Amino acid sequence: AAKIRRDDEVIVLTGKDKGKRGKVKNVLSSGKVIVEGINLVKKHQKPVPALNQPGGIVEKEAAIQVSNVAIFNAATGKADRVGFRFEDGKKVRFFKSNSETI
Amino acid sequence: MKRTFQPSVLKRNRSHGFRARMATKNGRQVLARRRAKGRARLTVSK
Amino acid sequence: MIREERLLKVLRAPHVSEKASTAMEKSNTIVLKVAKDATKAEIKAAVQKLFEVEVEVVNTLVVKGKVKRHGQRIGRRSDWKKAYVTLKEGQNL
Amino acid sequence: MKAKELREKSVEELNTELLNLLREQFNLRMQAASGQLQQSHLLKQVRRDVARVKTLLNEKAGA
Amino acid sequence: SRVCQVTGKRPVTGNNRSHALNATKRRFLPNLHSHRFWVESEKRFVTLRVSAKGMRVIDKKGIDTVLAELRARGEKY
RNA sequence: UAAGGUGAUAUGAACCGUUAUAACCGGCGAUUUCCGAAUGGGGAAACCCAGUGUGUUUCGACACACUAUCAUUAACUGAAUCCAUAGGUUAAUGAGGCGAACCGGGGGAACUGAAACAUCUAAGUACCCCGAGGAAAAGAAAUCAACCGAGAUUCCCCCAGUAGCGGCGAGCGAACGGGGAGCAGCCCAGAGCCUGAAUCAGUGUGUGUGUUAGUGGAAGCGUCUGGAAAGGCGCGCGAUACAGGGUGACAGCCCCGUACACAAAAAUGCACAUGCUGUGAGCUCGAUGAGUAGGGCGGGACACGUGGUAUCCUGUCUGAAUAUGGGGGGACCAUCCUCCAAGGCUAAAUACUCCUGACUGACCGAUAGUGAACCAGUACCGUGAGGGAAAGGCGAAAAGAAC
RNA sequence: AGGACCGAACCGACUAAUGUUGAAAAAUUAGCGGAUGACUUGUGGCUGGGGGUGAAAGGCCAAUCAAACCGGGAGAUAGCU
RNA sequence: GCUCGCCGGAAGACCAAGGGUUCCUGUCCAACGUUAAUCGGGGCAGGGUGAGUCGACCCCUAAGGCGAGGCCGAAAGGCGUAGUCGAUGGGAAACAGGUUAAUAUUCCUGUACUUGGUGUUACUGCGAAGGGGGGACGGAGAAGGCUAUGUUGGCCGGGCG
RNA sequence: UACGGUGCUGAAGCAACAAAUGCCCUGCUUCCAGGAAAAGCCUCUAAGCAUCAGGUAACAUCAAAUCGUACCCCAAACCG
After folding, report:
1. Which of A67, C86, D23, E50 could form a cystine bridge with E54, CB 3.0-4.6 A?
2. Domains of chain E, with CATH numbers?
């Protein structure tokens, strides 16, 4: 299974400001995730029909590496690792160093 | 000046075509060599 | 026994929709894109069954596909069959 | 036990396939060539459903 | 082809050798003749293209044993 | 198995989906147009034209199946010709064609070397053709040896560049014997004592065991420089895991993994009372592969070029003895020794890689390595057989430059 | 009537000039020979390399001919550069 | 647009072969056009090829090809009977106007024609990889009768330079 | 009238002469070098059947499928 899921409160590990923590919005097949408010890039949008007619320098989130993303623990406010140990075919995620089910 | 290539698709297909290759065992060897080389067109006449 | 309703999938698109087709509907005929292997009896039965109209004669031609791309990737569009289906009488809608 | 098309194991699969093909797929083709929006998934859904009913007609002999 | 049909003799291949020992490729052919053998059990004639050694074998063994060997080999006559 | 997906350039659009049923992966099925052995007839491949049945019919017609040739077998008919054969028709079974190498057989060069060239060599090589298998071939002494003995075939190392062959030139080149890999021998040519009584082949679960999806899988924080830390410094921790790859610079502890422990609805590779089907065991007695061995002529193969030349094969012509018999022991003859040709089957050690998977490299790195790192046997060239390229890299991320 | 005569289409190619990195890997221009015949031409077929075909020059056989072209033996051999 | 020149047994028109969208319309001018290009047989988009009567297919054969069996050949294969293919030849049938930016004996209008299937009526010997006829054929020359076509006159319309 | 052009109406529409290498003519004459084949078409019967099946004539109705069809074609679209 994937350790970082679609709606996970996660914290960045490397790159730009690595202190910020946010929620995943999309998980890509290339091993990358979109986390809310993390890699803000200023795209120079050309004019086009349908949406974004005038264009602009509106900020948009870039995909960051899921290895550069670590999950967050609310009880111990640090980065944490994820394991998959439960008895049936549905494996739950648990925090390492806390042994608590996510 | 009359040049050497004077086209005719009937004579092209009778001389170099797929069934003209398949009639003789040697033209079947030609087709085997072209499949082994991997040609996009076996008989470029056809 | 009019041909099978499975086989009456020969009609592909209603209306080629340019001045020749619209002028032919203004005077006499519907223009359709009808399969590749559809015969005139199949087009006649398919128009008369899938629509309420009555057809007198069907004229078909085969349109050859064009190349339309530069020399880096030369490709060809598909051949299709165009049917001129004559049903000029007896409709108001 | 990952897909559920046990729902149409009843009789009149020929009638169901006839309703799937007769003017359903045809009208979606006419609509897609005249121009309407939603047909992009509906055309695929109807041709897949035709494939389900034809596989079940090859599977069973009682319908 | 030039096959004995009873002893299986085919053309074999060897050399013309001369006084100067120049080897030239040649072939040795069987002494093949078409002969009608009278069979008494079938009361008829069977034509076979056989060698002279094949006719010696037919004289020694009988034509019935020979034709039984030809049917065992599957060869038509 | 899963929280994400609807293959790529390739975004969009319209949608599908919560882990108990979207997508992905695996087993088993369903479908599988037309051509092509192409197989109903034809044909300028991917097209043209049918015939016979069965069914539907709104009478316009439509759907499905079969219909090639050859071989073998069976049935029914059937001439010259009374019998019969030849022939004809139908049915059943098998084959056909493709594929890189290895293997057996049929045919088979020349350039070249001899410092020319013809014997010789190259070389039974290249090539052509036929056939088969996972190996093929060969194979259980009419074999060697030397008066001592060995005990089928095949492959490796010696013997040994020896003995020899050779315009005794160029060159070709053994065997005996020894050390190893591997190693079971049988059956018919025939009758009685026996009738599943042990092998062999086929056949659906079982055990054990691999394959075709997968599952869990340890342990890192602070700080400095920096765009970014995996780097410097400090303090820990895991290790049956410090193979490897990615991550914004060089990561055992970020991710995928790796060591290890496991997992199979189903389909499948191998040892048995394996339920059975067939062949068929051991004992006594008998037989012991004839146009054959040998010979004359011409050739070919044996390292051996006809030479003093044994041995094998046979195109031609001949032609025995037949276990008180026959073959061999390198002209030949005596003696002695050794073995039974003219009928077959036979695993292993041996050869090869179109392919599949894993791993490795004092192998290459874009004029190199495959011709081809890239939509390459492509674009182009040629009537055709055939020939045959050039062409990789923005950035960490398009943030690919709004205005 | 005529392998008759003159002369266009058509077939050919005797002379000259130009062109010779051409407009053209044999042509253009001005004349020239045949033009009812051993003529000329379209389409299709057949003959295949020590072979074909040749009113014969070793001409022609796909701009290649005292032995075509392609692939292979093949890295033939080269006392020569 | 108005003049000027050139071909006019073609340098005009229609096909066959061969090619394969070069055809028509909109847009663009980087590359391609031996110069510029607003143009193009160039680039990018759409459109466009309508048949019972034209051709192919189809029936039939020539040269020739393949060829069940067959004869021959080390193998591959060679020849060849029945047969079956093979046009460059022989068999059914449509003409004139009008129309599109681009089709045209195909679409439209007018007037036709041919070959088969089925059904009804009336009469009746029908029936064949068979027999016969016919298809069905050379070169040259010479009439005659025409016609396509052209000229002139009449007629009609316009003119009065 | 956007000057691509559209629509209505539309008079005479006859005669004589000269004419082909085209047609009659695959004819006629003449010559030697003596000039495809098979089917479609017509006719005759063989085996077979007898108010049957068929063949003629009339009428009515149905069918004639499929593929090509643009454009160049003494050429800037073919071979060079």
Report:
1. E50
2. 1-77 (2.30.170.40)
Estimate the crossing angle of helix D26-34 against helix D39-59, to 10 degrees: 160
Distance C66 CA to H22 C1' (A): 12
- The radius of gyration computed from the CA coordinates of chain A, to the nearest angstrom, equals 17
Resolution to 1 decimal, in Å? 3.0
Backbone dihedral angles phi then psi of residue C82, each to the nearest 5 degrees: -110, 125
Residue A5 CB neighbour total at 10 angstroms: 15
Mutation target to probe the C interface, by most C beta carbons within 10 A, among D14, D26, D53 is: D26
Residues 37-56 of C with CB under 8 A from D: 50
* Method by which the model was determined: cryo-EM
Distance CA C85, CA C55 (A): 7
CA distances for C49 relative to C53, C60, C91, angstroms: 8, 19, 15
Tokens 């509106």 belong to A58
B1: domain range? 1-46
If you count residue pairs, one on C and one on D, with CB atoms under 8 Å apart, how many are there? 22
